[PDB]
Amino acid sequence: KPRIPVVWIHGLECTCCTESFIRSAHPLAKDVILSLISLDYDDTLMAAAGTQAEEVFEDIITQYNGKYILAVEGNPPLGEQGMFCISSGRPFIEKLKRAAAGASAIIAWGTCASWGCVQAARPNPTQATPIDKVITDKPIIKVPGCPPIPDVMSAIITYMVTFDRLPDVDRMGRPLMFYGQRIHDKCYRRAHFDAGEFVQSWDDDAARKGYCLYKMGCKGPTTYNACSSTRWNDGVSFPIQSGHGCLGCAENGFWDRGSFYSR
Amino acid sequence: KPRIPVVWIHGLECTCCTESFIRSAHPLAKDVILSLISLDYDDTLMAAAGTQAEEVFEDIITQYNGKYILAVEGNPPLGEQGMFCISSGRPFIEKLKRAAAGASAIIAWGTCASWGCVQAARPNPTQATPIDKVITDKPIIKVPGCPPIPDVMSAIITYMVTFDRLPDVDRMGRPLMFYGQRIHDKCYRRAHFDAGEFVQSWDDDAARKGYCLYKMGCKGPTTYNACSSTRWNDGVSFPIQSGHGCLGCAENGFWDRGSFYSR
Amino acid sequence: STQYETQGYTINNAGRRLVVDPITRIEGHMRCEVNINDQNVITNAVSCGTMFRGLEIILQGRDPRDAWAFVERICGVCTGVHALASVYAIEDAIGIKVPDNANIIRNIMLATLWCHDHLVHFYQLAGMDWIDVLDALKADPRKTSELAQSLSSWPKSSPGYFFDVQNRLKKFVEGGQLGIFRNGYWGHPQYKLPPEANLMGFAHYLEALDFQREIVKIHAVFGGKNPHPNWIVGGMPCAINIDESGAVGAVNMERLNLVQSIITRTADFINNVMIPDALAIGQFNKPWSEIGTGLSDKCVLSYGAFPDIANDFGEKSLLMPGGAVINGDFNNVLPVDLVDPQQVQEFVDHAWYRYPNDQVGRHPFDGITDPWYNPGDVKGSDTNIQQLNEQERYSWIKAPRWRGNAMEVGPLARTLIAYHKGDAATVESVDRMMSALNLPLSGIQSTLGRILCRAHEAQWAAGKLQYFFDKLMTNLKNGNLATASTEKWEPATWPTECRGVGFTEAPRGALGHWAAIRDGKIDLYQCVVPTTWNASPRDPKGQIGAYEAALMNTKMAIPEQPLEILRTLHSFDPCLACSTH
Amino acid sequence: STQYETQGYTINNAGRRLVVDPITRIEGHMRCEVNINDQNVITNAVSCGTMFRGLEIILQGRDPRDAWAFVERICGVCTGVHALASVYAIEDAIGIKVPDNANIIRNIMLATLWCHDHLVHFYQLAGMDWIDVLDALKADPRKTSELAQSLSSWPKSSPGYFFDVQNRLKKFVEGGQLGIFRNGYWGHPQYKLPPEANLMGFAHYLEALDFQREIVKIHAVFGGKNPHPNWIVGGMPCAINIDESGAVGAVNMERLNLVQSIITRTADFINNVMIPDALAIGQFNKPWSEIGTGLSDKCVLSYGAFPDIANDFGEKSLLMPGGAVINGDFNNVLPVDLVDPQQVQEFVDHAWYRYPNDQVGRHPFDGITDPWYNPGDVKGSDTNIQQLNEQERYSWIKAPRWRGNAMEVGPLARTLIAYHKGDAATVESVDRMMSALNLPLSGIQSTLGRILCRAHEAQWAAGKLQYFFDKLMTNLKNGNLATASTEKWEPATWPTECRGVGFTEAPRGALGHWAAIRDGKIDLYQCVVPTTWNASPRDPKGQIGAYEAALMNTKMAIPEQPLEILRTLHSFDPCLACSTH
Ligand code: SF4
Ligand code: SF4
Ligand code: FCO
Ligand code: FCO
Ligand code: SF3
Ligand code: SF3
Ligand code: F3S
Ligand code: F3S
Ligand SMILES: [Cl-]
Ligand SMILES: [Cl-]
Ligand SMILES: [Cl-]
Ligand SMILES: [Cl-]
Ligand SMILES: [Mg+2]
Ligand SMILES: [Mg+2]
Ligand code: NI
Ligand code: NI
């Protein structure tokens, strides 16, 4: 029985979101690709290149017009008439608009597609712009984080396939299931925060006991994600567990909310 | 290069401690037995039975006198002249005493060997007694829990092998590394406890959001273990994460500290 | 020395007495004694449980809601099954109906346990009775690869792999520290595998030791931890949230995805490693289809298990059939009623307990657990037993009977009940299996048969795991999330006096918990557990239980080395902590 | 049209033009154009980076302690390497020395990255250029098993396994949704593996896709997460506690045990799956040992990496040698100095940037990143390019040179440098590898050689992983726990003006970050990254970079199908986000 078509496109990016996706522990990314979805276009993984690849792109968006999911990694630059990101000799933004037009829905992977991420940090040399400021007529599910958690990415896909619907979202379009609560509201170091038990300098006795990282700049109190519950890399760790405060990487504009080591 | 000899004996028990050990994810129990220690006696796993098994027991404790680790699961009953637990026709406590006398050090696995566990709960029909009240002239490392965490059991073994010493202990003989802090002091639901956000009845809205289980009788505030940090079964879960309050199962006398659902 | 007749057997304590204490590669503490005649054949068999803790005493005065946590600790091998029976018993007493998802998750917990327990038993407990591990050092790696590839699609079959396994075993032995292999029965003539099958078996022992840790991750997700997961009266505490804020704090899509991944791997391991291994042990040890019959052709018992309709414990709901056969009459599968005082009764005339009249059996609602260590005229002394006196009291295990009959419980019993009730899956499994071995149907009623039926049950349970998971997901697709009923959580809602039975089929057989509640507290808590049945001592008529019967009439090649005794006992998968509680 | 000579090549843009835009199975955005003569031979090659973000601009005015986190996001494939180079640079500027354990853990992070990145490149990026995935459907499973077992001890080799893999593929394509395999080059005459080797390679593609996720668990332990772990100026934030209260909150024995388990599995997979597959591709594609040489027999560059003596970046410390070869004189491995203004320079006369004088090169401490999108006289328009004009500006990639020379960087370059410095382990690996293929040593200077060297290096890194881990454990045994230096954490302790260089060997080659700090803020931050070197456009003398040179003189079987172009480009493992930053 056929699998749901997914077109995965790439703007200005570091490819962290693709890399996170293939980390998925359950379902394995292998099984997502072979059994759960039909990953019909993706420059990073596909056999075809050049004219062969673009024939696939055009065939898929035509034949499955109105019936495919568009996944977007990275973002479009508006500067230099869009040619800070060139795709088949033309601005990326034009490929984005074409792909968006045929999609039933769009997944904005990562802080890049959701908000802007690092290229949009001051002074945004390329005028990198999040998808929802370019595409204003389609459902967009924001899955932020730099990158998002692997098993979050795959759980959102399994939800779509199993329940035949988009995840319900918050006011910013993030799936409630994984972005409804703050890092700090599910943090295992919260007892220390509450007691005033803080790391004050790296590798002090507090650090060696897993005390709270608030005074080292942790942005968990203002950041919504599943890192402190679902955790990373098959439940192995998350930023705070390994001794670094949250950077705030799931939140809009986190790069320019001051030093990671300041309040 | 010869591996440290370990003699593992079993008193009154349910065998949860042996079962926990073989769950070890890293090192695999397989690798502990083939590469790290010499598991020279263990009734639950050994090929030999009866006279053949006791020939092994006697020879090991003779040949390696002063140089083996004694691991103890379960505990000795003092009732009925010790014959609530019979070992080769004799009271278990006699076997415990003979094994203890040649050991370099003893590991008291689980709440049974550490404290007494379920058979010692009121009214303790058999007069089940923890190891340290019977063997009083040997190093005893208490590793409590019902059972202890698999990867904590194997971590303690690796510490002994790699460092050639016993873990440092608290005033009750528990390894500081895993028992120095409370469940509640590293609990990911602590934010909810601090906010007065509590499950009030099973499967309420609060429960469906992972709120704190204190009002449902969670004993995390008085229990020292690694469950909320290290977690269970290769970092998959722990009691609180799966929605049940801590029972207090690493603590002396926990069965008789009132209903698990009461304060 | 005396002789008497019971159940077709001549019990005769003339001749050499052999003692095996401890029985190893079981849970907990057992001693076994036999007498052998001049042809080295067993003419007397004595089953002794050598431990007691007293959970039935400890449970008095506890809150019924707490009971599951105490009785779970009856056993860490069959971890969970006593919690399940407890919440069933308490719910039955009070009149609690749980939500469908709670029932489905409970079934998943039980099926997970069946898979895990049966796998570990096959390899780590019984395996070395059949696999000569030390003989694997003589195997050809290529011939081992060829054998494995002839039996299974399992991927891990390369010559190099078997060489690596063999080489590891070699270097392990070279160390002069044989560990769990020291002073085994290696080379005994009853070891029939060729070296290649021993190397294949040993490699699988190691692979199973590793893989078993994964199966219980299902218990960790729904139950917090394994061993000894958590449960509640009223359902399960693992609240579900798929699509709402805070799903990170509950059973969510990522958690369910983990569970699905474990199910698939678990089926794959059982179907492609354990099942071919069990068939191969069959093929090389066909004479053991005629040894250890015991009560399996006379009297077998199942209560049934896995209610597929939530809160319905009837015949149309239980996926695992219940029923009783007596007198070798497999054409009349009788119904079991756990409240009927004339059905299940326990005797203690040959056990270390006090009753007002030890010549009568007590139904568990009239049960008494008053320990009395009195071994009588042993050879030796009270604290140094050289020979138990089986004419008097000789065990910490009570003697259960069903309508006065001594019964066998467990996988073989269940298979026979299901087969004779005409369950289609079971008939076909059993027919095809015995066909593959070119043995008559009667060969299943044996020590070999016990092992084969247990393997097949692991396959069955792995299949049901998926079925139950899919039923959970179907409920979730329909917006049915409930995991607990709390209508009667509060003691004020309960009857002032009520009693209940919780029953299931644990990995080893028919399990029941009988609970009486009075004034908000446990007034009485009596357990009758599968190994209580199988390892039972004698009764006032001198009738022997399943172990003693299965050992009767058995040839030993080398009296000093109890390989044949171990084989038969291990085939029942003894759980001694269970048996005594 | 125009013709000129450079570096022994005749650059001729007469004749038919071919465009490949996008290059797929790379990180990021690349366009390639060539001209081919009548004989289907490439006579001109044009490398164009088709993306830019401007990290060098974004970093100005930032706190130096934050820099690592920004620059880490240059790339999520080579994740971590820019963070390492950043902390090195800031430490070099300020004068900070990290404790040994921090250096060891950094080395573990780098080796982990090498293992993971190389593995994924081989299978997921380059693999389908060598493995005909559809041809795998024609294989015989038994013959596939026999092939795999002839090459490796790897366990997963049964005929049933290969049948199951083949059947998954069959089912996948049966619906007509070929996904990532759609419109591939399958059946192209340059695919030379037999069906059995294709099925073996495809199975391994799938196994590698699964396994790679495990390797990065090391990054998760020490660095919180992967992609994009965390770091600090002054060492690492992953405080260690082995034997004190609160070890549950730190890197403890259980955490270290997890790491060890991953190391062993990683070495096993690389040595038993990837290494034999790399040799098998070599055995069936020997002509590719003479294709794509490019600059690899002329000019190669390594900065060196893995300082084994903490805070010592000299030749006695770096476990991966540094040095430069020019003019094909592999007897003169020249020392590299990243501060010398006459060594590393970047040119932009053929790139989309502004310099005061575009005919000279600028050392990175004098670097300028002033974007200027000016493709000049293209075929087409600024926003619809049919053909770039390689006589003018044609890339977002700057053109690095070393003493004016165009250099190749990456696994092959490093292997050559270490070989010619007399590194025993490298000499033996190379000699044995080329012996196994019956090829001359010169055969490593090639598209095939780049792939073989990369696979080699994954084995080397897996070995070093264990070495570093053992060093860490040795320190812990000695009570040496420190992971951070913090006496210069505060900006007021820093020089008012200072500058530093942080350098390493990323998976793709030589990486440098040049940082100037002034008044507690980043004043300048210039990156020169391995794919900047390899994918470089031309310079004022018209000298071509490594990709252009490697593509020169290449035969194409079918002009419209860029299989040969992809093979050579993929062999360098292009990272375009890296190249442009
Ligand atoms: S470490 Fe960060 S998220 Fe955790 S309690 Fe402290 S401030 Fe909150
Ligand atoms: S769930 Fe238990 S341990 Fe966690 S915060 Fe609440 S009371 Fe404390
Ligand atoms: N299976 C099992 Fe344990 C026994 N006997 C119980 O119930
Ligand atoms: N490897 C790698 Fe990325 C590139 N090019 C960096 O540095
Ligand atoms: Fe995830 S491509 Fe990497 S930068 Fe932050 S999300 Fe973007
Ligand atoms: Fe762990 S054998 Fe099981 S009861 Fe509590 S520890 Fe004891
Ligand atoms: S930095 Fe990002 S990965 Fe999670 S812990 Fe903070 S949202
Ligand atoms: S019940 Fe026991 S397992 Fe841990 S969470 Fe509490 S100490
Ligand atoms: Cl794209
Ligand atoms: Cl942003
Ligand atoms: Cl013992
Ligand atoms: Cl206790
Ligand atoms: Mg009982
Ligand atoms: Mg640069
Ligand atoms: Ni049991
Ligand atoms: Ni990169």
mmCIF file with all atom_site columns, N, CA, C and O in Angstrom, chain B residues 242-254:
data_model
loop_
_atom_site.group_PDB
_atom_site.id
_atom_site.type_symbol
_atom_site.label_atom_id
_atom_site.label_alt_id
_atom_site.label_comp_id
_atom_site.label_asym_id
_atom_site.label_entity_id
_atom_site.label_seq_id
_atom_site.pdbx_PDB_ins_code
_atom_site.Cartn_x
_atom_site.Cartn_y
_atom_site.Cartn_z
_atom_site.occupancy
_atom_site.B_iso_or_equiv
_atom_site.pdbx_formal_charge
_atom_site.auth_seq_id
_atom_site.auth_comp_id
_atom_site.auth_asym_id
_atom_site.auth_atom_id
_atom_site.pdbx_PDB_model_num
ATOM 1  N N  . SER B 1 242 ? 7.409  6.580  34.501 1.00 0.00 ? 242 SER B N  1
ATOM 2  C CA . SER B 1 242 ? 6.335  5.752  34.002 1.00 0.00 ? 242 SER B CA 1
ATOM 3  C C  . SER B 1 242 ? 5.073  5.944  34.850 1.00 0.00 ? 242 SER B C  1
ATOM 4  O O  . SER B 1 242 ? 4.100  5.216  34.661 1.00 0.00 ? 242 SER B O  1
ATOM 5  N N  . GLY B 1 243 ? 5.110  6.890  35.800 1.00 0.00 ? 243 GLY B N  1
ATOM 6  C CA . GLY B 1 243 ? 3.877  7.403  36.422 1.00 0.00 ? 243 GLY B CA 1
ATOM 7  C C  . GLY B 1 243 ? 3.583  6.874  37.822 1.00 0.00 ? 243 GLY B C  1
ATOM 8  O O  . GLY B 1 243 ? 2.486  7.138  38.343 1.00 0.00 ? 243 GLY B O  1
ATOM 9  N N  . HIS B 1 244 ? 4.476  6.064  38.414 1.00 0.00 ? 244 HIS B N  1
ATOM 10 C CA . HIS B 1 244 ? 4.262  5.579  39.770 1.00 0.00 ? 244 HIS B CA 1
ATOM 11 C C  . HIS B 1 244 ? 5.256  6.264  40.707 1.00 0.00 ? 244 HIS B C  1
ATOM 12 O O  . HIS B 1 244 ? 6.419  6.417  40.344 1.00 0.00 ? 244 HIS B O  1
ATOM 13 N N  . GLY B 1 245 ? 4.821  6.752  41.868 1.00 0.00 ? 245 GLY B N  1
ATOM 14 C CA . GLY B 1 245 ? 5.779  7.290  42.822 1.00 0.00 ? 245 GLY B CA 1
ATOM 15 C C  . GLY B 1 245 ? 6.826  6.253  43.201 1.00 0.00 ? 245 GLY B C  1
ATOM 16 O O  . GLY B 1 245 ? 6.573  5.043  43.198 1.00 0.00 ? 245 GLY B O  1
ATOM 17 N N  . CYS B 1 246 ? 8.006  6.763  43.560 1.00 0.00 ? 246 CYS B N  1
ATOM 18 C CA . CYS B 1 246 ? 9.013  5.946  44.206 1.00 0.00 ? 246 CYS B CA 1
ATOM 19 C C  . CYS B 1 246 ? 8.390  5.271  45.434 1.00 0.00 ? 246 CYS B C  1
ATOM 20 O O  . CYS B 1 246 ? 7.619  5.903  46.174 1.00 0.00 ? 246 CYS B O  1
ATOM 21 N N  . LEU B 1 247 ? 8.680  3.973  45.604 1.00 0.00 ? 247 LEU B N  1
ATOM 22 C CA . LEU B 1 247 ? 8.262  3.186  46.760 1.00 0.00 ? 247 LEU B CA 1
ATOM 23 C C  . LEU B 1 247 ? 9.220  3.370  47.925 1.00 0.00 ? 247 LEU B C  1
ATOM 24 O O  . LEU B 1 247 ? 8.925  2.947  49.049 1.00 0.00 ? 247 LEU B O  1
ATOM 25 N N  . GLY B 1 248 ? 10.411 3.895  47.621 1.00 0.00 ? 248 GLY B N  1
ATOM 26 C CA . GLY B 1 248 ? 11.490 4.017  48.609 1.00 0.00 ? 248 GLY B CA 1
ATOM 27 C C  . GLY B 1 248 ? 12.395 2.770  48.676 1.00 0.00 ? 248 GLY B C  1
ATOM 28 O O  . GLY B 1 248 ? 13.090 2.529  49.662 1.00 0.00 ? 248 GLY B O  1
ATOM 29 N N  . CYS B 1 249 ? 12.496 2.022  47.565 1.00 0.00 ? 249 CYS B N  1
ATOM 30 C CA . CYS B 1 249 ? 12.938 0.628  47.625 1.00 0.00 ? 249 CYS B CA 1
ATOM 31 C C  . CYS B 1 249 ? 14.414 0.428  47.922 1.00 0.00 ? 249 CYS B C  1
ATOM 32 O O  . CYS B 1 249 ? 14.807 -0.693 48.258 1.00 0.00 ? 249 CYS B O  1
ATOM 33 N N  . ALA B 1 250 ? 15.211 1.491  47.863 1.00 0.00 ? 250 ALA B N  1
ATOM 34 C CA . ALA B 1 250 ? 16.606 1.421  48.251 1.00 0.00 ? 250 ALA B CA 1
ATOM 35 C C  . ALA B 1 250 ? 16.825 1.674  49.747 1.00 0.00 ? 250 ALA B C  1
ATOM 36 O O  . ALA B 1 250 ? 17.961 1.566  50.215 1.00 0.00 ? 250 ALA B O  1
ATOM 37 N N  . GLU B 1 251 ? 15.784 2.059  50.490 1.00 0.00 ? 251 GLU B N  1
ATOM 38 C CA . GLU B 1 251 ? 15.956 2.469  51.874 1.00 0.00 ? 251 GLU B CA 1
ATOM 39 C C  . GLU B 1 251 ? 15.605 1.341  52.852 1.00 0.00 ? 251 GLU B C  1
ATOM 40 O O  . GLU B 1 251 ? 14.636 0.596  52.678 1.00 0.00 ? 251 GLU B O  1
ATOM 41 N N  . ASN B 1 252 ? 16.393 1.285  53.915 1.00 0.00 ? 252 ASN B N  1
ATOM 42 C CA . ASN B 1 252 ? 16.170 0.365  55.028 1.00 0.00 ? 252 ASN B CA 1
ATOM 43 C C  . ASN B 1 252 ? 14.736 0.476  55.523 1.00 0.00 ? 252 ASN B C  1
ATOM 44 O O  . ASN B 1 252 ? 14.283 1.573  55.869 1.00 0.00 ? 252 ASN B O  1
ATOM 45 N N  . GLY B 1 253 ? 14.013 -0.670 55.542 1.00 0.00 ? 253 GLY B N  1
ATOM 46 C CA . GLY B 1 253 ? 12.706 -0.696 56.176 1.00 0.00 ? 253 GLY B CA 1
ATOM 47 C C  . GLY B 1 253 ? 11.583 -0.111 55.328 1.00 0.00 ? 253 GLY B C  1
ATOM 48 O O  . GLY B 1 253 ? 10.519 0.189  55.861 1.00 0.00 ? 253 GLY B O  1
ATOM 49 N N  . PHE B 1 254 ? 11.809 0.073  54.013 1.00 0.00 ? 254 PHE B N  1
ATOM 50 C CA . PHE B 1 254 ? 10.868 0.837  53.218 1.00 0.00 ? 254 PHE B CA 1
ATOM 51 C C  . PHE B 1 254 ? 9.478  0.211  53.194 1.00 0.00 ? 254 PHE B C  1
ATOM 52 O O  . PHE B 1 254 ? 8.493  0.939  53.049 1.00 0.00 ? 254 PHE B O  1
#
